[PDB]
A paper describes a structure:
The H3/H4 chaperone CAF-1 is conserved among all eukaryotes and has important roles during DNA replication and repair, regulation of gene expression, and maintenance of chromatin accessibility. The budding yeast CAF-1 complex consists of subunits Cac1, Cac2, and Cac3, which differ in their ability to bind H3/H4. Rather, the Cac1 glutamate/aspartate (ED) domain is also required to tetramerize H3/H4 in vitro. These results support an architectural model for the replication-coupled CAF-1-H3/H4 complex, in which Cac1 scaffolds all protein-protein interactions and is predominantly involved in H3/H4 tetramerization.
Although this putative dimerization sequence is apparently not conserved in yeast, purified S. cerevisiae Cac1 elutes from size exclusion chromatography at a molecular weight consistent with a dimer, confirmed by multiangle light scattering. To gain structural insight into the putative Cac1 dimer, we crystallized E. coli-expressed Cac1457, a region that forms many stable intra-Cac1 chemical cross-links. Even though the entire 457–606 protein was present in the crystal, only amino acids 520–600 were visible in our electron density, and the 'wing' (576–581) was disordered. As expected, the structure we determined is virtually identical to the reported Cac1C winged helix (WH) domain, with an overall root mean squared deviation (r.m.s.d.) of 1.14 Å for all atoms. Indeed, we observed a crystallographic homo-dimer. The inset shows major interacting residues buried in half of the homodimer interface, which is arranged in a head-to-tail symmetry with identical interactions on both halves. Therefore, Cac1 dimerization is not necessary to promote (H3/H4)2 tetramerization, consistent with the functional stoichiometry of CAF-1. Thus, the WH domain exhibits binding plasticity for different partners.
Author numbering: 520 to 600
Write the structure that this text describes.
Protein backbone atom coordinates (compact mmCIF):
# COMPACT_ATOMS: atom_id res chain seq x y z
CA UNK A 1 0.00 0.00 0.00
CA UNK A 2 1.94 3.03 -1.33
CA UNK A 3 0.08 6.29 -0.74
CA UNK A 4 -1.13 8.16 -3.82
CA UNK A 5 -3.34 10.98 -5.06
CA UNK A 6 -6.91 9.82 -5.50
CA UNK A 7 -9.03 12.95 -5.85
CA UNK A 8 -9.84 12.87 -9.60
CA UNK A 9 -9.75 16.66 -9.94
CA UNK A 10 -6.34 16.55 -8.31
CA UNK A 11 -5.23 13.77 -10.68
CA UNK A 12 -6.33 15.88 -13.63
CA UNK A 13 -4.39 18.89 -12.30
CA UNK A 14 -1.38 16.59 -11.93
CA UNK A 15 -1.66 15.15 -15.43
CA UNK A 16 -1.93 18.50 -17.23
CA UNK A 17 1.46 19.28 -15.67
CA UNK A 18 3.20 15.94 -16.08
CA UNK A 19 2.15 15.21 -19.66
CA UNK A 20 4.83 16.52 -22.07
CA UNK A 21 7.11 17.84 -19.31
CA UNK A 22 10.72 17.24 -20.25
CA UNK A 23 12.05 17.86 -16.74
CA UNK A 24 13.50 15.24 -14.44
CA UNK A 25 11.18 13.47 -12.02
CA UNK A 26 12.52 15.67 -9.22
CA UNK A 27 11.63 18.92 -10.96
CA UNK A 28 8.33 17.50 -12.18
CA UNK A 29 7.35 16.63 -8.60
CA UNK A 30 8.37 20.01 -7.12
CA UNK A 31 6.25 21.70 -9.77
CA UNK A 32 3.25 19.48 -9.06
CA UNK A 33 3.43 20.06 -5.32
CA UNK A 34 3.11 23.79 -5.92
CA UNK A 35 -0.23 23.17 -7.64
CA UNK A 36 -1.16 20.51 -5.03
CA UNK A 37 0.34 21.76 -1.76
CA UNK A 38 -1.52 19.38 0.53
CA UNK A 39 0.40 16.29 -0.56
CA UNK A 40 3.97 15.33 0.32
CA UNK A 41 6.49 14.86 -2.46
CA UNK A 42 6.83 11.10 -1.93
CA UNK A 43 3.10 10.71 -2.51
CA UNK A 44 3.30 12.80 -5.67
CA UNK A 45 6.35 10.82 -6.79
CA UNK A 46 4.48 7.60 -6.00
CA UNK A 47 1.58 8.89 -8.10
CA UNK A 48 3.78 9.93 -11.02
CA UNK A 49 5.66 6.61 -11.06
CA UNK A 50 2.22 5.00 -11.22
CA UNK A 51 0.54 6.78 -14.11
CA UNK A 52 3.44 8.08 -16.22
CA UNK A 53 6.62 7.13 -18.05
CA UNK A 54 9.66 9.07 -19.28
CA UNK A 55 10.48 8.47 -22.94
CA UNK A 56 14.07 7.78 -24.04
CA UNK A 57 14.70 10.27 -26.82
CA UNK A 58 16.30 8.70 -29.89
CA UNK A 59 17.59 12.23 -30.31
CA UNK A 60 14.11 13.65 -30.96
CA UNK A 61 12.12 14.53 -29.14
CA UNK A 62 13.97 14.77 -25.79
CA UNK A 63 12.89 12.73 -22.79
CA UNK A 64 9.28 13.70 -22.06
CA UNK A 65 6.65 12.19 -19.77
CA UNK A 66 3.40 10.65 -20.99
CA UNK A 67 0.44 9.20 -19.14
CA UNK A 68 0.46 5.53 -20.07
CA UNK A 69 -3.34 4.98 -20.17
CA UNK A 70 -4.95 7.63 -22.38
CA UNK A 71 -8.22 5.75 -21.83
CA UNK A 72 -8.37 6.05 -18.06
CA UNK A 73 -7.31 9.69 -18.35
CA UNK A 74 -10.34 10.32 -20.56
CA UNK A 75 -12.61 8.80 -17.89
CA UNK A 76 -11.23 11.13 -15.23
CA UNK A 77 -11.91 13.99 -17.66
CA UNK A 78 -15.47 12.67 -17.94
CA UNK A 79 -16.00 12.35 -14.17
CA UNK A 80 -15.49 16.12 -14.15
CA UNK A 81 -18.76 16.19 -16.23
Amino acid sequence: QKAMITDPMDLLRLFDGVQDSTFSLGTVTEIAQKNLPQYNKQTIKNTIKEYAIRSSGKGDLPRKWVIKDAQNWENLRANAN
